[PDB]
Design a protein around this ligand. Sequence first.
Ligand SMILES: Nc1ncnc2c1ncn2[C@@H]1O[C@H](COP(=O)(O)OP(=O)(O)O)[C@@H](O)[C@H]1O
Ligand SMILES: Nc1ncnc2c1ncn2[C@@H]1O[C@H](COP(=O)(O)OP(=O)(O)O)[C@@H](O)[C@H]1O
Ligand SMILES: [Zn+2]
Ligand SMILES: [Zn+2]
Lengths: 574, 582
Amino acid sequence: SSLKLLFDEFLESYYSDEIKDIIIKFPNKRSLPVNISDLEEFDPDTATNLIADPEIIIDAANESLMGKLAGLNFDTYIPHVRFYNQSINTPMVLNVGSAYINKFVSIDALVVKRSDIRPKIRDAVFVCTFCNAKVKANLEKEEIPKVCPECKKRTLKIVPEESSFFNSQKIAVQDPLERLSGSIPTWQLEAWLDDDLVNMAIPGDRIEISGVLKIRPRKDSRGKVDPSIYSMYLNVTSLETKQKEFADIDISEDEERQIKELSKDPEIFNKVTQSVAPSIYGYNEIKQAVALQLFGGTPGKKLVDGGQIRSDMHILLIGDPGSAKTRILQSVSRLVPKGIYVSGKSVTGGGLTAVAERDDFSEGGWTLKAGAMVLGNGGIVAIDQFDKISEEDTAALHEALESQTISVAKAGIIATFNAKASVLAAANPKFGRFDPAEQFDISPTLLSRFDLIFPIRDIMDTELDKSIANYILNQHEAAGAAIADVPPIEHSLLKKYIAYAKRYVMPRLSEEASNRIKEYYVDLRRAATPITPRQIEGLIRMAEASAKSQLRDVVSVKDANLAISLSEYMLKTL
Amino acid sequence: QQTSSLKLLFDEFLESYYSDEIKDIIIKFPNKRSLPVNISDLEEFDPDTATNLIADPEIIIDAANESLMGKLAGLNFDTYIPHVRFYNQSINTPMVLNVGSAYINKFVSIDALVVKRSDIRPKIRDAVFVCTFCNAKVKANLEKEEIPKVCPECKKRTLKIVPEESSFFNSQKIAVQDPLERLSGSIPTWQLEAWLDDDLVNMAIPGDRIEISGVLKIRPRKDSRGKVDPSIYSMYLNVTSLETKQKEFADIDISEDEERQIKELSKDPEIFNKVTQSVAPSIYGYNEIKQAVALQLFGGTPGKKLVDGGQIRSDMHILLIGDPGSAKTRILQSVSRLVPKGIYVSGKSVTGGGLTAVAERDDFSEGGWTLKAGAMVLGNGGIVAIDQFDKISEEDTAALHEALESQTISVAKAGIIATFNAKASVLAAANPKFGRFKYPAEQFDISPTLLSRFDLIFPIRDIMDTELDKSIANYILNQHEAAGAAIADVESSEPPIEHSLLKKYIAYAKRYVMPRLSEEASNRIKEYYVDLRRAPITPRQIEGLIRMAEASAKSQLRDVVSVKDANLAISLSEYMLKTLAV
Ligand SMILES: Nc1ncnc2c1ncn2[C@@H]1O[C@H](COP(=O)(O)OP(=O)(O)O)[C@@H](O)[C@H]1O
Ligand SMILES: Nc1ncnc2c1ncn2[C@@H]1O[C@H](COP(=O)(O)OP(=O)(O)O)[C@@H](O)[C@H]1O
Ligand SMILES: [Zn+2]
Ligand SMILES: [Zn+2]
């Protein structure tokens, strides 16, 4: 019991508040994530033992947590201690081997496949066919029993109506393609998720998956067992998505205070604005707009007929080569938690607006088709080379930008795929260099969808050129220095702040601001681009975003004036 | 003992709540043998038995069936059996993705897209068995007992089922997943098995969205080589009820109270105006368009046949060509939401994935037919809103002529010659060629021939009136303002007709009202044409006129078409011409 007693101290010390939370929320919340850093700080021997004999250590910790969870019902569910974050055994999926057998390993994983939920028995009950006795067994702690204890015949039959079940699942995992020097490996590591872990590793996610490597006798093409060759499978203990979509970002109580204090900074917006694309000089108006976009407009609005109104914003940059269009796109994609960067050029059936169709000879009955727009999941999809867009994509992006859906009527299925995303597109103009609206090669009906369209021109002011040059060198000098070994807001905080603002601030239009926007519209109508009612919605969106940028629940005329300002800047470049 | 008590509880509950329904089942047995039972009513009667449904569904469902048989004493249950089918609960509403071990042998209700359905497979319930060694007859219900494997008298494994002395009941396997509108990312690579028995069979057609309820079950999982896994199991739902929450116009149910309610609407002079104001609330203006959409929602008199036994189209087709930002998509989308099962689809297609796609015989495909069905084939009489009609593929362009006129798609391919049914009221919308809007007709890339098939073409233009801009601006701002205030539950400042009532009103008018032209109205249209003809106008305009006027009669639950209706058809027609001139 030494270990259990060891863990009792440990758990109480480092995770007492968390354990209390579990006591309240059990069985709905039933797992305790435990950093291994803490455990190695608390007993470096225990932590080292964990890596080489994890099953015995993990069992002890789970028993300790069950003890601290005193007075609760464990007839149906069992508490789980889920250790994560270690750096001793961090192999690549391709390099997992015999050295990690029955050892704890953490791997950077791309989830490729996920199976159906397959109920598995834990507290089992068996009946003897011959002598009718009932034998009980715990399949998570001993092997499936084989003989009746009274008549001694090998005749024990499982009775599932009297046994307990817990979820289980098989996933296929691979190395992220970003970590491979050459061609893709032709195999995937099998992994098993149990209980609450299930359906927490969707295909396409990148998760640090941790657990215990295990082996099993190999079965060949015919199912014939091996002479002495084994296959491998990892039993997962924890799952850490290091980088998390805004909605899944976890904000702590202390962090919640911290974010709120940031709100009171009267320059908070300009700090967010400066973190958009720090590597490039200038383009302050572009950045401001990208900053408004990150926060987005007020979500969850319905029209009188129940038609949901778009909050996400769309921005199209147009310019010549060397206009830092790719770099901005790529930088914004890195800032956002889950960001997509994709080129417009597509092969038919490999578009941005790709959606699954129905194939009876495919797994699940649906083809494995999904483009950037359906994988957006509310984030920013940075589409470079927007001019290269296919005709199929061009037509589908109308609905995708406006309604944030992709509707299909094919193979007897009527469906509307969900395509929420904030597009930051970039396009070079027709015939290379600029001469403004006419030379884009983007449809006028699709341009309408974008809220702000900022054309970028090269004024070639020499003083400006000298400033640019100065900046660029500086960066390089610095980078060089870093190899030699001689920020407005921190990134992590920045994301959390935005996540908080998107989750808990829903700006609502004041009368004064509504009236300012109305006046600007009508004035604009008086006397290249058609100024339809559409533009009014864009001004609402942007203004609402300014409010959400300061964590304010009401749109001011100050907000509306930032929106009208960015509009007018777009308009200045005729 | 406990089962007896349960039977009496159910007797009382069924007399109190479902007396009339049980009597209808007595009259029409076996053709009608299923009693839908809303759980909410069992909530009320004894909440404890309602919780026991979710926890021990099979015990109390078998009890309720037992009771319902008791209430149907005297009827012959040799072939068919009555069924109690519970629905409407909200305690266990899992997603198909997340269904799991917590619901094993428990009641669950799932929002489901049917994807596959199997062949009907007869299955034995009241089975007879005979022994090859001692000729002993063993009887058993196989839904309650397992299959006898060893003869009781002769004690050997020789039992043999006798199909000629056994009873049978239909069974069907269906495949189900979550609606794609509910998934957040990629489609799961799996889909849940469900089983339909007796009268539930062929009530889950591929493509339907049905709230499916039943008891989740487990079966031992088999390997790729048929070897059972040790403690690993597979899931499958034994469906006990199907509730279609959407319901197309014809399947919609109308209570007597509703009938009373609906009729009263009919007497108000401005019902049509009121309806016309329910079409696209979110948009401001577009009244003529709204009026037409309103007339399209009712349609002309169905069942008209020509002297030669042909069919006369009753459904109306509308096209809206306008500039970007002229609210085209929203109207299309709003109308699609209002109608029960509406399709909204883009005109852009790939070869073999068009609006007029139809099945093609193919032996290599499952079932001897390809999985091909577009919006027109799936229209089931609803409104099929096709945006970006200027991007229609040549193949679709050609097939839509016949689909719009004859409401059929005919084919002679793979040795099969047949005519698919494509009944639908299209509400198309297109942008002009070379972007922004001389002769309007030349401005858009649509064949003249295909344009002849629409009854109404509404061009939309910007008249740039400042006051109109002012008016619109106020209108939009007010809308948003209100929505934002609602998110916070503080109000600072209502369809003329409730949505459900409007749906049922239209459904009623479509079932029962069948307008017949009066000579008064007939003459006005009859004259109209000729005068219009003086100084591209064809005879089909008259047909459109008739349809629209008949629809104005149906809009007011009137069996006769008045001249007043004819005038309204003329006015819309007039508007189109005026607008289309130059
Ligand atoms: N303010 C700036 N304006 C323009 N270019 C800049 C600025 N700051 C840095 N650059 C340089 O511009 C180039 C980035 O352009 P990028 O988008 O990658 O190419 P392209 O625009 O043609 O796609 C880089 O050479 C970068 O160093
Ligand atoms: N009352 C109105 N009158 C005119 N236009 C409106 C009105 N209300 C909204 N709009 C705007 O008109 C747009 C409809 O898009 P749409 O015109 O269909 O584009 P396209 O013409 O390219 O299909 C919407 O984005 C909407 O914001
Ligand atoms: Zn025994
Ligand atoms: Zn026998």
